[PDB]
Amino acid sequence: PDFLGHAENPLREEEWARLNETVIQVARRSLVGRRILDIYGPLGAGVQTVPYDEFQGVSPGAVDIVGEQETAMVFTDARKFKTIPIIYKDFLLHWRDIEAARTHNMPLDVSAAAGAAALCAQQEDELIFYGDARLGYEGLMTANGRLTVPLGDWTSPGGGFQAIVEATRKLNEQGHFGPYAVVLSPRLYSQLHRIYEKTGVLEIETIRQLASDGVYQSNRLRGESGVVVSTGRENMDLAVSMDMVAAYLGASRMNHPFRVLEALLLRIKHPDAICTL
Amino acid sequence: PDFLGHAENPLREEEWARLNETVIQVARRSLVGRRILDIYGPLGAGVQTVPYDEFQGVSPGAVDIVGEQETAMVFTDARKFKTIPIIYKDFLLHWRDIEAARTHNMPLDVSAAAGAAALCAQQEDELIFYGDARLGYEGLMTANGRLTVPLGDWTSPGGGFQAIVEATRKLNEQGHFGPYAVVLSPRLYSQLHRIYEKTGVLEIETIRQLASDGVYQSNRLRGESGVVVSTGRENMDLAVSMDMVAAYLGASRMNHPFRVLEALLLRIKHPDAICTL
Amino acid sequence: AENPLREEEWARLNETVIQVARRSLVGRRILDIYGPLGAGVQTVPYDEFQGVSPGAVDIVGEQETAMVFTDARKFKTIPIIYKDFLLHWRDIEAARTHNMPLDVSAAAGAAALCAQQEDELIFYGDARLGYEGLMTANGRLTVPLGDWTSPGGGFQAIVEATRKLNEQGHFGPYAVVLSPRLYSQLHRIYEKTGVLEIETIRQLASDGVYQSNRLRGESGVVVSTGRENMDLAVSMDMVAAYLGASRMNHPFRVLEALLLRIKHPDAICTL
Amino acid sequence: VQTVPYDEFQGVSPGAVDIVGEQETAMVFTDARKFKTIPIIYKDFLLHWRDIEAARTHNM
Amino acid sequence: VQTVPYDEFQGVSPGAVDIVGEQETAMVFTDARKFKTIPIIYKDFLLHWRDIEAARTHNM
Numbered sequence A, B: 001p002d003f004l005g006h007a008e009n010p011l012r013e014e015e016w017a018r019l020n021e022t023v024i025q026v027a028r029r030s031l032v033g034r035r036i037l038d039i040y041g042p043l044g045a046g047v048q049t050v051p052y053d054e055f056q057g058v059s060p061g062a063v064d065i066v067g068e069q070e071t072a073m074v075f076t077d078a079r080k081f082k083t084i085p086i087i088y089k090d091f092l093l094h095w096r097d098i099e100a101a102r103t104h105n106m107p108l109d110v111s112a113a114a115g116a117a118a119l120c121a122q123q124e125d126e127l128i129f130y131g132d133a134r135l136g137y138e139g140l141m142t143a144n145g146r147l148t149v150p151l152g153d154w155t156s157p158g159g160g161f162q163a164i165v166e167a168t169r170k171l172n173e174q175g176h177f178g179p180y181a182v183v184l185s186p187r188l189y190s191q192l193h194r195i196y197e198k199t200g201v202l203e204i205e206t207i208r209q210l211a212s213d214g215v216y217q218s219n220r221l222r223g224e225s226g227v228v229v230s231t232g233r234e235n236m237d238l239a240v241s242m243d244m245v246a247a248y249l250g251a252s253r254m255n256h257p258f259r260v261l262e263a264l265l266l267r268i269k270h271p272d273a274i275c276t277l
Numbered sequence C: 001a002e003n004p005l006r007e008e009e010w011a012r013l014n015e016t017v018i019q020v021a022r023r024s025l026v027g028r029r030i031l032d033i034y035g036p037l038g039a040g041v042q043t044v045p046y047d048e049f050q051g052v053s054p055g056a057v058d059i060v061g062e063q064e065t066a067m068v069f070t071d072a073r074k075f076k077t078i079p080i081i082y083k084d085f086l087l088h089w090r091d092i093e094a095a096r097t098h099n100m101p102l103d104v105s106a107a108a109g110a111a112a113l114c115a116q117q118e119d120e121l122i123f124y125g126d127a128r129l130g131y132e133g134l135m136t137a138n139g140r141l142t143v144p145l146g147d148w149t150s151p152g153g154g155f156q157a158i159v160e161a162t163r164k165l166n167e168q169g170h171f172g173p174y175a176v177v178l179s180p181r182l183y184s185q186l187h188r189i190y191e192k193t194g195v196l197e198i199e200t201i202r203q204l205a206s207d208g209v210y211q212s213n214r215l216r217g218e219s220g221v222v223v224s225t226g227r228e229n230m231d232l233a234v235s236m237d238m239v240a241a242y243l244g245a246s247r248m249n250h251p252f253r254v255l256e257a258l259l260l261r262i263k264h265p266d267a268i269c270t271l
Numbered sequence D, E: 001v002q003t004v005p006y007d008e009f010q011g012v013s014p015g016a017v018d019i020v021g022e023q024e025t026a027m028v029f030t031d032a033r034k035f036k037t038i039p040i041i042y043k044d045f046l047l048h049w050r051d052i053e054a055a056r057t058h059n060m
Helices: A013-030 A095-103 A111-129 A161-173 A186-192 A203-211 B013-030 B111-129 B161-173 B186-192 B203-211 C007-024 C089-097 C105-123 C154-167 C180-185 C197-205 D049-057 E049-057
Strands: A180-184 A212-217 A226-230 A237-248 A258-267 B087-093 B180-184 B215-217 B226-230 B237-248 B256-267 C080-087 C174-178 C209-211 C220-224 C232-242 C250-260 D016-018
Touching: A013 A111, A013 A237, A013 A258, A111 A237, A111 A258, A161 A180, A161 A203, A161 A226, A180 A186, A180 A203, A186 A203, A186 A212, A203 A212, B013 B111, B013 B237, B087 B111, B111 B237, B111 B256, B161 B180, B161 B203, B161 B226, B180 B186, B180 B203, B186 B203, B186 B215, B203 B215, C007 C105, C007 C232, C080 C089, C080 C105, C105 C232, C105 C250, C105 D016, C154 C174, C154 C197, C154 C220, C174 C180, C174 C197, C180 C209, C197 C209
Parallel strands: A180 A212, B180 B215, C174 C209
Antiparallel strands: A180 A226, A237 A258, B087 B256, B180 B226, B237 B256, C080 C250, C080 D016, C174 C220, C232 C250
C-alpha cells in the first residue's frame, strides 16, 4: 500500500513537465550542430528511413527567349536509403529522494537529467561532425570531396584571414556560393579571437562579416581543424525523427532509471559545400 | 492474468500479509543486536540523515534548598549528521507456486522469504557489530576509545570472570555504571560452559548475575573477541527509518523477485560504555 | 514498465501462434489430452501396468481375486517449454502509422521451435531430466523393422507388430508414425494389383499413418490410439506472454506445459 | 512504404524446457538492421488511338 | 531541513552509443552519495527600552 512495486510512471505531472523542460533547455544550450544546419521537420517516431539523394550536379540554369533548355538534373542509378539512429543516456534516480520530495524536503533534484542530456547532445554533435564506421555514416570532416585547403599560417598576428578567404575561393570555384557558415575547434577559435589584426579590429569581426552566417565554436571537433559550409538547403539537411525527450526505461533494484531519446541523421545532399583543413 | 506481465503487484492481500509476517518473525528470531539496544521510533521512508549527536559530556548535578547551583546542561559535543544506509536481500518465486497456492495449496510457500530474511538479519548484525570503512561508520569493536583490556588467560577456570570484573572496574573508573550486558564470541561462549574438575558452579551463571541484562552469543562477531556494554539510552541508540519490509522488483523472466529492506543506523551517543579485548 | 499492444495486434499474434502450432503438432493427432488443468497444477498421477490378474473367476457368487490398481503410486512434474523473441518499439510505431502489417515473423519462428521441441519431447524423453520416450520406453516390444527396400516390405513388419500387440492382449484401432524417409519411400505403389502400399497399411491401421520429421532415419512406431493407454496431460495450451519491457524493446515468450503419461506401455513397437 | 526491415541472420539457439523457466532463451540481433528498399518492375502497352475509336461506334 | 543531497561529477560515459535498438552504456548518477549540513549565519545586536519609549512619544 505504498511506493514499493514495479509500477508505471512514478513521477507526477509537474515533475514530468520539469524534466522535459530541463532536457529541452540544456539541449538548446549545448547544440551547435542544429544552428549551422537546418532540419527537415519532425517526421515522427515511426519513420525509420529517409531518402538520401545521390550527389552533386554541375548543371546550372539557363535563360532563352523560348524555354528549350530542358534543364535536366536527374538521379542516375539508385537512391541508397539510410536509417535514423538513436542516442541515449541514464537517469539513476533514488527512490528515497522521490519519497522525500512528497511529504518532506521537496526540491526534486534532476541534476542527473541535465548531465545526461548534455552528454547525449555532445554525442549527437560528435555524430554530425564525425560519422562512425560501425554504422557506415558520413561526417563533415570525413566525407568524400571535402575540397581540402592547407592552413599552415596561424600563430601569426594576422595569418588567419587568408585561410578562410582561400576556402571561400575554392568553394566558389565549384560554382557553389552563398551564405557561408564556419565552425572551429576551441583553441583555434580562441586564437582567432586574438588582438587587432594590425589593420583594424579583432579578426573575428571581419571573419563574421565575410561568412554572413556566424563563426561557431565546437569543443567536439579535433584539436586544430575547422570547416566552412553553405548554410542553405538543397545542399545539407538534418532529418529529425523525434526531438530530445525523457522516457522511463524500467525499475532498477529499487531505483528508477530513465533514458533521453533523439533520432537524428545528417543528409549531405551535395558534398560540394564542405571545406576543411 | 499472468501473461500480461509487469503488473503493479502480483500477490494479494493475504499473501503480502504472510510474507511480512514471515520476515518479521525470522528477524525477531535471529537478531541479537536489537535485544540490547533501545530503538528510535520509526522515522519514515523519506528520512536519510539522523543527528548523530554526542561524544562526551558530564554535569554531576547538585541540589540545594533554593534551587540555584548553575550546572551546565549536557547539550552536545558537536553535530555530525551521519547518513542512514540501507540493508537488503532478495529472493524469488516461480509464478506457479503463486498460482498453485490459490487452488491446491491454500497457504503460499514462502520459504525463500525466510531464507532471505535470515541473511538480511545476519548482515544487519554485522553492521552493528562492525563498521565497513566505505562509509566512515563506527562499530562496537572498531570505535575509537574502547577501553581495551588484556583478557587472554583462559583455559583455566581460575579466571575468565576476572576479565569481566576488570571490564566493570574500567567502566566504573570512567564514571559510567548501570545495567551491564555482555556479547561474546562463540569460541569463548562455549569455553565458558566448561565443566572442568572442581566444578562448583559454572562461570556462566555468575557472569549472568554480574551483568543483569543477559550474556548473549553472536556468530557475526570475530572468533576471539567479546564486549561489555551499558544497555541504557543516552549511551547507544538505533535509528530505524523503516523495519523489515518486503517489496517488489518487477517481473524478470516471468518469475517474481522480491527484496527485503530495512534502513538502520547505529549511533553510539557515549563511546565510553564500551569494553573489548 | 507498461503493456505494449492493444486488442487487435494481440489477437493477431495469438492467431499466428495457434496456426503454427496446429500445423506443426503431430502428437496431438495421435494422443488425446487430459483436459486443460490450468496453470496451477504442476504434478499429476501416473501409470498402472502389469496388472496380471485374470479376473476370469467366472463363479456363481464370487471369488476373491486381486483388484487392479497402480503398480507403484508416484508422481511426475509437468515441464514447461518456452521460446523467447523480441520486438522493437519503433517497429510497433511504424506498424501503427505508416504501414499496418505488424510483422510477426519472430513469433512464427518461436512457435515453430516450441512445437519442434515438444514433439521431440513426446517422441524422446529428456534423459538429463529423466522421462519416458516412445522409442526409449521400458517394455517396448521391439520388432525387427529390417529387410525393407523390398517388394513385400513394411507390410511384413506392420503385421508382425500388430500380432505382437494382439498377443499381449492389447488391440483396437491402431495408429502408425513413420520417419519421413520411409513414409515417402514406402510408396512402393505395386503391392500386387493397384493399391498404394501405404494405402493398404492405412487400411490395416484404420487411424492414419502419419510422419514426423523429428524421428531418426530408420525408425517408426505403432500404438493403440485410445485413452486409458496413453495420455497427454496439458497444463496450458501454447500461448504468448509478455516478459516486461527492457531498454524500450519489448520481449515475449511463447509457453506450453505438456507431459505424456504412458499408462499402459504395452502398445509399443519399434525397430 | 519504400523501406522494410531486413533481419540479421541465422540463430542456432533452440528452445528449452525446465521445471521453472530460467533458460532466458536469448535470440538478439547484434549490431544493426541494414534496412533495404523495394524496387519496381514495369512494361509497356502501346495501344493505338484508332483501335480505341473503333471500339466505340464500330467493331468493339 | 538541516541536510541536503550533494554533487554528481566526472560522469565519464559518452552515451553516444548511437545504435538502432540500444546498447547498455552506463547511467549517470552521483559519484558518491553523501550529505552536508546547512550552516547558520547570524549577527546579534541590542536595543534599549528607553529608546523605544522615546521613539514612541517624543520623536518617531
